[PDB]
């Protein structure tokens, strides 16, 4: 391979063997320098693919997917408020049908990108779809599968105390800070009709594990295939329907695809065309801190039965009389009476005209279209009008009821995306002597557009009905559109010498819409070398290859980042907004992000060198790459002192750097005609470092964070993703300071840097057995390093449910290194502490994070996982023969089967987020639904 940077090719068979709805999730831990995480285990969700770390401080770091080989739309659809209404609906590449994948090839370097443009800076996932035959006999391949999912990891709970606060008993608590379990009959919950439920005060450990069912999902695939000496035709249809382990149909994903791809050669001239249609309907059991389903589930005392709260003829479960009023509702109700739906119709495809002429030349024209409509319909009942008066939840809770002012809301949004891409190329390929010159010169044109229409309606008249006319109060209406365009010209020169020295030289030049008129043009060259020794007695070294490449790759800004705009006047206030018009007056404000027509194109320089060797007839094999990736002058909306009149300014950041080692090992310790055993060990170690952010705006900028709480940044001397949290004060050396009177730790002056987001190293191992027609595959995914915010740990600490909180058998205690600080004027003196945290105040010692305080809730990102297990029995051809089958392969598999995590983490599967599949998702998990354990069957029938 003349390629002089790292890359990896995966066969369609390995992609679809894992039988995932999705093309990338099965490659989760199997490819070095390609970090593949799923945002959650909700059906239909996004998937994250970052290669050689985050280069783009905000907020685009997926690789350019490229199907045939047309750029594919990879946009993502998730909630702009992960704190209160969190939901994730899809990734662009979730549409591609894994049974139509023939070869994936993940380009990783940013040095030879002229063919695939600027978006390649983040890697390219070159996909190439199946085609023609001939083959015995008629062309049909049928795949139909069936899988279940099961909850994988719930937080480790405690079963020593029950419902209560301050340590005392309580009938209505949303938490477990009560007396020790007696077994003694006690009351709980509200009083209805002068009666009340009375039950043994005993723990129930399974009471959450029991809430969940087993998600089910059925899959059906069909393909039709054939060919001649001048043509080929593939026609395919995939179908999926998923109903996850959360109860009800609230966790739904339906996927349908239909694709027709065909080629024909007469000439000289070849013409082919791919056309595809993709449907999906999602329903997301929303997460958040409000009346959502999970946050309502964790806030459950350890003695309360959750599967008993479902029946709604037991008046104690109807919204009015549910056992707790503390910002929480019956989960079964939230899933049954709320709406969060997403539907999508997509059309994308390509046309390609290849015409060979004059012995050595080839003309190729390629146009791609990818256009989408999607429609969200979220809504929630008028909880107030239906349940406030009368119920103790209710009038009885005054200003503080869960139903105020939950007066009902319904919105609807229709989103339209369209991008057309044009490639016009003329290749050249002649051999002279032992040399071989191939050159390629082309033109690329690209236009991308997105727009959406939104209407929302509040305070619903008929409480249940979700319709843009069931309201007496003014509707809210929003409308947006974006348009970018890019033209470019590129040449790629391939040198060669007798199949031994390959040299490549690419150069591209783009003119982008998103950069200031006066500075639209940026040029980036690239040089690649490849040296096979090997070609220089021993049948011991199958293959050897040494690689080097130095290249650049520019980028442009996001849209509309040059001119200052005036917006319609609105002000953000905590948990609200005060938006114009009022009253009868409309008004505009000066936009809070200063624009800049002094910008210059972004530039990524890479230096990469690698080595590849194979031994003993491809029975021991290893590939190693080292990379040094810089990314300078990235356009970013850098933070700024608001007193300047603006809240941020668009300017050119400094270098974001990723260096690291990408290494793959693979050997076949056994081989016969009847049994093979392969091993594989891949290892990735990356070093991420923000090198500088413009000095004059201070040093740092926020990437995501709570107001006065744990927030992740991008600081000048540090990695991408340095957290800060409230750490506890400590004296001149020791020495937790606590309050003289409560006993509780004492916040320090500043927050404290508490880790970055990055795994220190990631690696994966894999084994593959074959015995006659039997296959067995196992894969493990190892990541260690880094850290993430976890509201899962946060709410199980606040609630007193998490195992860690039975710390001192919940007897009064003195923080074991505590010290009071004695300040008089400016005299500072430290004294052994003598004040305990009392029983009544144990709840607060944990509620705020223990002696760690806030920072307690940055969880050790690290995990080890049993990624997948795939057993496959290829029936032997003699078996069938009296049947119309050309092949049968029964298959049984499991995914995300088991997670291991380091002691301090007994809360989550770290592979979670409530903030999307890119950079900001690294901030953490905001009570995302639990991850799940998937397993099932799949039958293949070739005709």
């Amino acid at each position: 391979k003349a390629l002089g940077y790292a890359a990896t090719s995966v066969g369609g068979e390995k992609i679809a063997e894992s039988r995932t709805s999705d093309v990338m999730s099965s490659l989760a831990g199997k490819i070095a320098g390609v970090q593949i995480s799923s945002t959650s285990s909700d059906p239909g969700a996004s998937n994250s693919v970052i290669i050689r770390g985050v280069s783009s401080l905000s907020g685009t770091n997926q690789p350019l997917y490229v199907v045939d080989g047309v750029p594919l739309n990879n946009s993502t659809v998730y909630s702009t408020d992960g704190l209160n209404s969190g939901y994730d609906f899809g990734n662009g590449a979730n549409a591609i049908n894994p049974d139509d994948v023939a070869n994936m090839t993940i380009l990783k370097g940013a040095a030879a990108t002229a063919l695939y443009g600027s978006r390649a800076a983040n890697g390219v996932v070159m996909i190439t779809t199946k085609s023609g035959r001939k083959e015995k006999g008629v062309g049909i391949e049928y795949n139909g599968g069936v899988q279940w999912s099961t909850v994988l990891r719930l937080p480790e709970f405690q079963n020593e105390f029950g419902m209560g606060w301050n340590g005392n008993h309580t009938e209505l608590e949303n938490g477990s800070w009560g007396p020790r379990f007696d077994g003694s009959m006690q009351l709980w919950g509200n009083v209805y009709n002068n009666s009340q439920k009375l039950k043994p005060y005993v723990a129930m450990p399974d009471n959450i594990k029991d809430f969940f069912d087993a998600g089910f999902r059925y899959s059906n695939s069909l393909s039709f295939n054939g060919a001649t000496d001048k043509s080929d035709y593939y026609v395919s249809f995939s179908q999926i329907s998923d109903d996850g382990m959360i109860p009800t149909d609230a966790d739904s994903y339906d996927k349908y695809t239909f694709s027709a791809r065909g080629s024909h050669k007469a000439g000289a001239l070849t013409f082919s065309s791919s056309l595809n249609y993709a449907y999906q309907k999602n329903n997301f059991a929303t997460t958040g801190q409000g009346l959502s389903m999970l946050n309502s589930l964790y806030q459950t005392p350890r003695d309360i039965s959750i599967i008993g709260l479902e029946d709604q003829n037991d008046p104690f479960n109807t919204p009015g009389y549910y056992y707790t009023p503390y910002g929480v509702m019956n989960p079964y109700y939230i899933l049954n009476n709320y709406l969060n739906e997403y539907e999508s119709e997509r059309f994308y495809g390509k046309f390609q005209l290849d015409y060979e002429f004059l012995k050595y030349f080839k003309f190729t024209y390629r146009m791609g279209l990818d256009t989408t409509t999607g429609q969200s319909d979220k809504g929630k009942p008028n909880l107030y009008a239906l349940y406030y008066e009368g119920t103790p939840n209710g009038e009885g809770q005054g200003s503080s009821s869960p139903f105020s002012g939950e007066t009902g809301q319904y919105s609807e949004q229709i989103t339209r995306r369209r991008e057309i891409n044009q490639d016009i190329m003329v290749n050249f390929n002649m051999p002279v002597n032992d040399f071989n010159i191939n050159a390629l010169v082309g033109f690329n044109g690209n236009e991308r557009k997105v727009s959406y229409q939104y209407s929302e309606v509040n305070d619903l008249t008929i409480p249940t009905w979700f319709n843009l006319k069931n309201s007496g109060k003014t509707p809210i209406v929003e409308q947006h559109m974006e348009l970018r365009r890019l033209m470019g010209v590129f040449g790629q020169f391939e040198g060669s010498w007798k199949n031994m020295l390959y040299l490549t030289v690419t150069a591209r030049n783009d003119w982008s819409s998103t950069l200031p008129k006066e500075n639209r043009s940026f040029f980036y060259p690239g040089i690649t070398g490849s040296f096979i020794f090997s070609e220089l007695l021993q049948d011991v070294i199958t293959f050897g290859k040494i690689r080097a490449s130095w290249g650049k790759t520019g980028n442009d800004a996001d849209v509309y980042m040059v001119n200052p705009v005036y917006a319609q006047s609105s002000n953000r206030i905590p948990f609200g907004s005060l938006t114009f018009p009022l009253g009868g007056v409309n008004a505009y404000s000066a936009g809070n992000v200063l624009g800049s027509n002094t910008l210059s194109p972004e530039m990524t320089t890479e230096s990469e060198v690698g080595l590849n060797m194979a031994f003993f007839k491809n029975r021991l094999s290893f590939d190693v790459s080292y990379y040094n990736r810089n990314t300078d002058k990235q356009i970013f909306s850098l933070a700024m002192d608001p007193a300047s009149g603006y809240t941020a300014q668009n300017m050119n950041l400094g270098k974001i750097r990723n260096r690291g080692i990408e290494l793959l090992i693979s050997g076949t310790p056994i081989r016969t005609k009847d049994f093979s055993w392969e091993l594989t060990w891949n290892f990735t170690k990356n070093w991420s470092k923000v090198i500088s952010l413009p000095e004059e705006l201070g040093g740092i900028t926020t990437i995501y964070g709570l107001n006065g709480g744990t927030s992740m940044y991008a600081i000048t001397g540090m990695p991408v993703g340095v957290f800060k949290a409230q750490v506890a004060e400590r004296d001149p050396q020791g020495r937790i300071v606590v309050n003289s009177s409560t006993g509780l730790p004492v916040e320090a002056s500043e927050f404290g840097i508490c880790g970055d987001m990055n795994n220190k190293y990631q690696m994966g191992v894999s084994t593959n057995l074959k015995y006659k027609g039997i296959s067995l595959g196992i894969d493990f995914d190892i990541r260690q390093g880094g850290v993430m915010y976890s509201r899962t740990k946060d709410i199980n600490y606040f609630t007193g449910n998490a195992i860690q909180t039975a710390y001192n058998d919940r007897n009064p205690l003195i923080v074991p290194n505590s010290v009071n600080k004695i300040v008089n004027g400016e005299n500072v003196t430290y004294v052994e502490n003598t004040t305990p945290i009392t029983s009544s105040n144990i709840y607060k010692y944990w509620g705020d994070g223990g002696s760690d305080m806030g920072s307690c809730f940055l969880v050790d990102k690290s995990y080890v996982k049993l990624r997948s297990v795939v057993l496959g029995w290829d029936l032997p051809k003699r078996w069938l023969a009296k049947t119309p089958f050309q092949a049968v392969k029964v298959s049984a598999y499991g995914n995300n089967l088991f997670v291991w995590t380091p002691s301090s983490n007994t809360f989550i599967d770290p592979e979670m987020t409530s903030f999307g599949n890119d950079l900001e998702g690294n901030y953490g998990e905001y009570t995302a639904n639990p991850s799940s354990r998937r397993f099932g069957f799949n039958l293949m029938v070739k005709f």
Binding site: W177, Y326, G327, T702, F798
Partner: peptide, 10 residues
């Protein structure tokens, strides 16, 4: 510029 959580009841 940030985002507010809320505490709970108890």
């Amino acid at each position: 510029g940030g985002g507010g959580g809320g505490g709970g009841g108890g």
